[PDB]
Amino acid sequence: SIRAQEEEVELSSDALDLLTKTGVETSLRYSSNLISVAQQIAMKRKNNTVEVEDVKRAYLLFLDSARSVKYVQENESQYIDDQGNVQISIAK
Amino acid sequence: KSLSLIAAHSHITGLGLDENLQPRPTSEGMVGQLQARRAAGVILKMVQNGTIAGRAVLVAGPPSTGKTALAMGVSQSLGKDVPFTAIAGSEIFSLELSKTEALTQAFRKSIGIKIKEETELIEGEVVEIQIDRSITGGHKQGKLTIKTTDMETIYELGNKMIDGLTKEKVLAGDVISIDKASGKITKLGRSFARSRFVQCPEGELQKRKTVVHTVSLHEIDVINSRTQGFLALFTGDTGEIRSEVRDQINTKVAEWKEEGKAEIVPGVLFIDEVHMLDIECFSFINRALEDEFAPIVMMATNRGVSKTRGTNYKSPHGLPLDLLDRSIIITTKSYNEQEIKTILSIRAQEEEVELSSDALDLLTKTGVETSLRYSSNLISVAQQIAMKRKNNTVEVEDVKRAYLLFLDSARSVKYVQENESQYIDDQGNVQISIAK
Amino acid sequence: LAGDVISIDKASGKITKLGRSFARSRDYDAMGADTRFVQCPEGELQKRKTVVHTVSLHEIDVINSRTQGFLALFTGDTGEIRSEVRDQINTK
Amino acid sequence: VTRTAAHTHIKGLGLDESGVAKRVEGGFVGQIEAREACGVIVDLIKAKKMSGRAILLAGGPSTGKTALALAISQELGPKVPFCPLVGSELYSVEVKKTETLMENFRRAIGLRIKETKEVYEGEVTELTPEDAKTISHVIVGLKSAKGTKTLRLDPTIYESIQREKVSIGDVIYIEANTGAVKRVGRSDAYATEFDLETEEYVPLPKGEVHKKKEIVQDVTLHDLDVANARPQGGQDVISMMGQLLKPKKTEITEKLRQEVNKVVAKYIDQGVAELIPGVLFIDEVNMLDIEIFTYLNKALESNIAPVVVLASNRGMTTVRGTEDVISPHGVPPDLIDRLLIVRTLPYDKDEIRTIIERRATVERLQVESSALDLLATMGTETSLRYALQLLAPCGILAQTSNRKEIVVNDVNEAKLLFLDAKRSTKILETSANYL
Amino acid sequence: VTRTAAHTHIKGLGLDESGVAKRVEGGFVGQIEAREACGVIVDLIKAKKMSGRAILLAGGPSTGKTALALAISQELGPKVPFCPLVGSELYSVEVKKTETLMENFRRAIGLRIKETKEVYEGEVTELTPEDAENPLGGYGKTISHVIVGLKSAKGTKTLRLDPTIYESIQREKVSIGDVIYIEANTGAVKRVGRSDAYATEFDLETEEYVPLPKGEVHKKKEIVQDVTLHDLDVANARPQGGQDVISMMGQLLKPKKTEITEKLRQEVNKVVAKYIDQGVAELIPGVLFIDEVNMLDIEIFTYLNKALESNIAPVVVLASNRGMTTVRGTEDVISPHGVPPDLIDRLLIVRTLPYDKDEIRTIIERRATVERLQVESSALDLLATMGTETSLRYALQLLAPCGILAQTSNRKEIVVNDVNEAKLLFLDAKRSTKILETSANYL
Amino acid sequence: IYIEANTGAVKRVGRSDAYATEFDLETEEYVPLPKGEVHKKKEIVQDVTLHDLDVANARPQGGQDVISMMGQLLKPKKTEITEKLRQEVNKVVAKYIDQGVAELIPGVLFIDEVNMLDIEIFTYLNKALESN
Amino acid sequence: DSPFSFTTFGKTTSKFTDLIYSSRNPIKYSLPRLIYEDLILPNYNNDVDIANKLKNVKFNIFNPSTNYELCLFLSKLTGEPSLNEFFRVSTTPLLKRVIERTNGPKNTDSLSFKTITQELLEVTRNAPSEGVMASLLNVEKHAYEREYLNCIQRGYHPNVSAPPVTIEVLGSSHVTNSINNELFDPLISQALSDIPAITQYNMHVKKGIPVEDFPKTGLFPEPLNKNFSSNISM
C-alpha cells in the first residue's frame, strides 16, 4: 500500500488482497513490480482504478522465478544446457 | 609494385569458373574441389551483388585440403577496390585493446565508402624561370614559362608561388605537377634532354581529373574520435573507440547515401583458424552479424569435435551450436593421386623447376603416401641438389637424396618412439650418457 | 571591458568574472566563445555572508598529492597516493 | 539499392489502440503474449516516471528475442535513446567492468536542448580595427549576392580572424552564437590579380548574409560526463593530429556525477532542457561474471537508472565466476527476484512457412508454392535459420540460369552444396583425421 | 689474449664443392647427414627466391643443434641478416606475442640502399639574424631570416636560412669560429667542432679541432646503407628526425612498442617496391632462428601457421629436444617435439644423432686445443671415458678447473691426479641426484 | 624580506602589517614584523628518512626542461628504484656520519597477518634480512 | 655515418642561395574533401560548433556563472585567488598548460600545505656546495662528474629517420593551413628554441618591450654530451 501510494497507483481492496496473496506465495518484489505493470494495463483500458482483472492479466503475462523454472524443466531439450546441447529443430 | 618472392598460394589467380558458375577441371591455378569452388563462386556473386549483408560462412575440412587456397582464390577474383581483411584467431588477444573492440575494428575495416571527387591539376615541362628580388626581399616578381608536347605558355606568379618554387627547387628541363588550390609542388623528374628520366606530358596543360576514393569505416571512426589523430591508423593505438562516435558515423553514412554523394561497397572478412577464439568472441559475433553495416564473414577451421576454449565441453568444429545455426558450411574433401600430380606440376611450373616424369610419379606416390605439403616442400630442395651436381633436370635419385636427408612426420614419430630414452618426455626425464 | 560582472573579496582578494551584463547584450553583435550573459545584480553592493564548507580527508590527500589535484578529484586518476602525505595530513 | 541483414522486416509490435496484436502485423508472425508484454513495457517506458525497472525475456534459440528488442526500439522511436549492447563488451582492458557498466547505464539517459543557429558569411569588404596596443572593436563589412551587411565585432573574435589569415577580398564564415571563424577562400573577382596563385577561388554565396535556423540538440548524460572528465585537458576545434600523450579512459568519480546532475537539474526547471530516459538493452546476459551481476543490483536501485532489458537462451546453467551455483537462464537468484520474465514459445510449420514467405518478399525474390513447401519442411526438419539463409543462394542459382523465379531444383542444389549443423556433425563423426 | 664461451671453435659447415661433408674439418665432428642438409638449406637461402620455408632440428640435449644454426650464420656471412631468438622472448608485458612474432619476422629481411645526400658544409664566418616588424603579434616567429657565411676549400657560400633551419642550427649551439655540417635531406645539423684556423690551447670545454673541409660547400655524395624492413616500420610508427614539433616531442618521450597495423606495412612494402624498381635497393632475405620452440604455446603456433604463408617471410629454423610432450597452452593432445601437427606438416625435420666414444674424445681434444690447454694422453682417455660415462657437457666444462689446478701446481700439463682432484671438487647431475635421494632434510 | 648569507637568494615572505590599510582592497598577505634582531644564527634539526632521500634524488629536481614540468603535472606513477641510487645515497650518508653531522636512527617496520603474503615475497624477505 | 633519410625533399639535379625546409614523408594518406568538409569544419548543415559550445561552455561544471558554490569550495581547497582558473585549466590542452606555467602566489588560509618532500626539494635550489642538504640532494650530478660521463662517446645511432606521415587533401587550402599550424606551431616551436641575443637587445632596449612579455623559450632538455646531440657521426 505504501509503495503504490508512493508510485501514485489507485487500487481496489480486492486487487490489493490478491497482490498480498501473490506476495505471500511469491516474493514481495514480484508484487512490487506487478503493481506498476498492472497500472499501465489499467490505463490501457481507459480506466483510472486498478481492478482484479488487470492484476490477473499482468500475472498471466509476466512470470516469477518458480513458473519459469517449471516451464524450463518441462522443456529442457529446447534450452542450451551446461554441456552446449540443444534440440533446435521442432521435428525429430 | 607489391613485392613478393614466391608464396604458398601465389599460383592461385582466382576461381576457375565459367559464365554459368561451373568449375573447370583446371583453370587459374586451381584443380579439384568442384563443389567447394562452386560454393565459393556463389559467395563471390553474393558479395558482388551486395544487396544483402551479415552472412557467415564456415569452411571446414581435413588439414592441407584447399581451405586457405579457396580463400585466396576468392580474394584474388574479388580484385581491387573491395576491402578484404585476412586475420587469424590469435590476433585479437591484445593487451591494449579488448577482444570485442578488436572484433569491431576488424568488422568495420571490411566496409568501404566509394567517393568520387575532381581536382584540376597543371602538369607540364618547365622551360625557363625568371626571379627578380629586392634588397630586403619584400616584393618579388617572376615569370614562369611552361609547356607540353602540344602547347606553350608563360605565367605571371605571385610571391607565394615564388616562395613555394624556391622551396623544392624547380630548374629548367623539369617536369612539374602544380596544384593551384593547395600550392603543392611535385617533381615528377627530368624530361628527355641529354644535353630520373620521364616523358613530357601531352594534351592540355590545365587538366581536370576525377579520382575514385575508397575509405573504410574504421578510418572515419579513428578520425572522428577527437582524442587521437590519423596517426593511430599507422601506429595502431586507436585505444577503445567509443560507441556514440560510431553512432554518428553510422547516421552520417546513411545521410551521405541518401543524397547520392557516396556509395557503400561491402567486403569480405576472413578469420582463419576461427577455433582459437574464445567463447566471449563468438557471443559478440552472433549479435554483430545482424547489423546493417556488417560484411560477409568467411571462417575456416579443421578441428573435429574439440573442446571450445573458455568452456569445459566439446563442440563440433570447436564452435557452439548457436553460432553454427547462423552459418552455412562448405565441406572440402581429400585429394586423389591425379589431383596431387596436377598440383605438384603446377607448383613445379610456378617455382621454375624442371622435372623428370619418373621423379614426378615418385613425388606423387610419396604425396599420396605421406602428405601433400611434404611433396610440395621437397620439390624445392631437390632442385638445389640438382644444381649442386650441375644439371638442370631433376631426376629420381635427386628426389631420393632429399627424401633421405629431409624427414616427414610419421617416420620421425617412429624414431621418437624407438629412441625415446634419449629425449625429454612429458615428465622431464632424459638419459644423456651412452654407457650403462 | 567596462561592463563585465565581477565580484571582489576584501579579506582575501578573491577575483572572478561572472560574465557580461544584459544591458550590453545588444552591443557587440556576436558575443564569441569565452563570454556569458548574466543579470546585473540588485540590492546592496556590500554583502556579508557566512558559508560552511565540509571537506573529506580524501579530498585533501588528492589535492596535495599533485600540483593540480582537482582534475584528479573529478577524473579519478589518483594513482595510489603514498603514506607520508597521509600521516602529515593526519598530524595537521 | 537496399540492404537487409536478418532484420528490417520488423517495423513494430503490430498492436492496435486496445493493446491486442493481430496475427500477422508489423512483420511479426505469431508470438502474441510476448508482444503484449513488450507493448506494455513500451507504454511503461513512454510514461516517463520510473527508474530501475527490469525485464528479462527468455526462450529457446531462434525464437525472436532480438526481434522483440528491435521492435521495442522501433515502436519507441528515434528520439528516445536506445543502447544496444552485448554482455561480452563489458570486459575491457583499460578500466574495470563496473565502470563500463555505469557508463552504459548513463548512456541511456538523454536530453533535448532547444538551440538556434545564426550564420554570417560572404565577401569581406572592410577590416577596420580601432583601439581604445590593445584594440577596442573591429568593424567588418560582409557582402553576398543579395546585398551587403556591416557588423561590429569584439577583439576576441578579431584574434581568430587574424589566426585565419583573413584579408580584404576573402569569403569567411561567422557563427555569431559560438564564435567560430572559418575561411573559405578568395573571391572569384580577385582571380585575375595573378596568372598563377596558390589560393583557391570560390564564387559569392548566392543567399543572404544572415540566416536563421532552429535546431534541436540531443545529448546523453554520458557525453556530459566525458566532457568534464578529460584527464589531459580540453582540445581545440580543429585537431587533425592528436595529442602527444594518449588519453585512456579513467573511472569517473561519483562527485562529478553529482555536479552534472546538479547542472542538468538547474537547467531543466528553466524550460531549456527536456529529460528523456531510454533503454539499455543487453543481449546474451548469461555471459556476465558474478561481480557484474552484483553491481547490477546496486546500479538498478539508483534514481536515474534506465529501464534495462536482458535476454538469455540457457537453462539450468552455472553462472560464470562460480563453481556450484545452478540458476535459471544464467541469472543468479538475487537478481532474478527483481526481474520480470517473459517467455518465448517456439513455432510450428505454418508460421515458419509464413516467415519464409515474408522474408522472401523483402528480398525481392519470387518462389513457387512447391519450393515453398520444401523450404518449410527443410526449416522444420533442420532449423529455421537454415531455411532463412538458403534464400539468397537459391536466388543466385536461379539468376544463373536466366530465371527470376525459384524452382525446386535450385533448392536441391543449394541443399547439396551448403550443409547445416547436423550433416556436418555426421560427416565429422564418420571421419579419420580431423574431418 | 682472446675470449671464448662454449662456441667459436665452429667456423662453418665445412663442405666440399659438391656438398659432401668431411669427417673432421671446421670444428665439426660427425653429423654428416645433418651438415649436408644444412649445406642444402644454406644454398637455398643463398638462392634468394624462396619465402616461407621452414625446418625443425630434432635431437636430444648436447647433440649439436644450435651449433648447426651458428654454422649456418657463419656460412652465410655477416651480410645476410641473422636473428637469434629464444621461445621465451615472445612473451612481452608491453605488447602481445602476435606483434612480437611479426616484429621478429620483419626484423629478418635485409635491404641495401644507395642514397644521395645534399650536403652544405664549411666554416661559419658570420651570424647575422634579422628581426620581424611585429614580433609580439602572437602568430609568426620572432625572426624572419638568418644569414650564414660558409667557407670551405676553394669556395665561400652565403646562405639565407629559414627559421626552421635556424632552430636546428641553434639547438647544437653553433657560433662564429666553428665547423658545421648541414644535411639537407632532413635538416639534421652536425657541429663538427672548432676550426684550427684560430687558436687551440685557449679553450676550457674539452673540444676537438677539425681542419677546413675539402671540396666545395655544396655537395652531392653517395652513401651505401644496410637496412631492414623493421627499422622502416618502427621509424614510421614513431616519427623522429624531422624539424616539426612532433619530431622533437617524439625524441623526448619514452619509447614503447606498439601494435603495428597492416596498412603501414603495405605502404612500406610499396615504397620498398618503388625503390627496388628504380635500381637502387636490392632485397636480402635472411634466416630467423628460434631455439626451444617447445616453449611456444598454441596461439603463437596458430599465428605462425598464417605467418609462414606470407609472401615476405624469411627462412625460419626451429629446434627442440622433446620426444612425446604435450603442447603448452593445451590440456590433453600430445604431438612430437611439442609442435602441433598442423605446423609439423609444413616443416622439413632434420634428425640429429648422438656420438660415440672417439667422437667425444676428439671433441674434447679440439676444445682443449681452442682454450690453449695441454692434456696428457692418459688424462684425455680418462676425460673421454668420463664423457661416455656421464655427459659430453660435464667433461667439456671440467677442463678449465684442470687448467687452474695445473697452473696452481706450477705445471703446464694436465695429469690424471689433477683430473681426480677436479672429480672430487665438482659434482655432476647423477651424483647430485643420488645425494638428493639419500638425503636427510632435502639436502 | 629574507636573506641567507652564503647563498644570497632573496625571497619575499610578505608585506608588513603597518602597510595594510592604504588601499580598500588588497590581495597580498601581511606577515608582521619578525621577532628578534636582523641577524641571528639558528641551529635547526631536521628528521628525514632514507626513503625520502631516495624519492627526492630519484625524481628530477626543479629544472627548465619540458619533461620535468610535464611529469610534475602528471600522475605520480611509482617506479622501480635501482640498487645504484640506494648505494650512492648510503655512501654519501655514511660519509656524513663520518663527518659527524648526521645521526642514523633505525626503526621498526611492522607487518601483521603475514599469512596473506605468498612465497615470493617470503623469499625476497629471506634475501633482504641479510642486508647491512 | 648517418641514419637513412626516409624522406623526399627538393634536390638539385646538377648573391646568396636560399635553402627552405621541404622534407616530406614518402607515405601519403590521401583523404577526400567530403569527410573534412562535412565532419570536421562546421557549416550551415552540421552542428559541430553548437555541440562544442554546449559540451564545453554551457554544461561545464566549472562555470562560475552556474556553479559558484563549487568554485568557492575549490578555491578554499586550493587557495588560488582566481575563480576562473579552473575554467582555464579544463579547456586548454596539456602543453599549453605546461609552457606558460607561472609561479603565482597562493593565500595562507588554505589546505594545500608544504609537503616535507617538497620542502626538501625547495631547500636546495640556490644552496651552494659543501652544504649538508645540498650534498644529500645532489647524488646524480655527483655520479655524473665522477664517472667521467661528459666526455664519453656515442655508440648507438638510429638506422632510419623519417618525418611524420603527410596527409594530403586535393582541392582545399584550409587543410594545408591547419596542417602547417599543427606541425609548425610557433608557440611550441618558440618554447623548443631560444631567441638570439642581438634580437633580444632589439626587443628590450630598441623597442621597449619588457622582459616578462617575452614568449617562453629554452624548454628543450640538454643532451648528455656534445656527441649525443646529433645522429650524424664524422
Ligand SMILES: Nc1ncnc2c1ncn2[C@@H]1O[C@H](COP(=O)(O)OP(=O)(O)O)[C@@H](O)[C@H]1O
Ligand atoms: N585446389 C587446389 N589447387 C592448387 N593448390 C592447392 C589446392 N588445394 C590445396 N592446394 C595446396 O595445398 C596446400 C595447403 O592448402 P591450404 O588450404 O593452405 O591448407 P589447409 O587446407 O590446411 O588450410 C597449399 O600450399 C596449396 O598450394
Ligand SMILES: Nc1ncnc2c1ncn2[C@@H]1O[C@H](COP(=O)(O)OP(=O)(O)O)[C@@H](O)[C@H]1O
Ligand atoms: N514472430 C516472428 N515473426 C517474424 N520473424 C521472426 C519471428 N520470430 C523470430 N523471427 C526471425 O527469426 C530470427 C531469430 O533470430 P534471433 O531473434 O536473433 O534469435 P534469438 O531469439 O535466439 O536471439 C530473427 O532474425 C527474426 O527475424
Ligand SMILES: Nc1ncnc2c1ncn2[C@@H]1O[C@H](COP(=O)(O)OP(=O)(O)O)[C@@H](O)[C@H]1O
Ligand atoms: N659436431 C660437433 N663438433 C664439435 N662440437 C660439438 C658438435 N656438436 C655439439 N658440439 C658441442 O656440444 C655443445 C652443445 O651443442 P648445442 O647445439 O649448442 O646445444 P644442443 O646440442 O644441446 O642443442 C656445444 O657447446 C658444442 O661445443
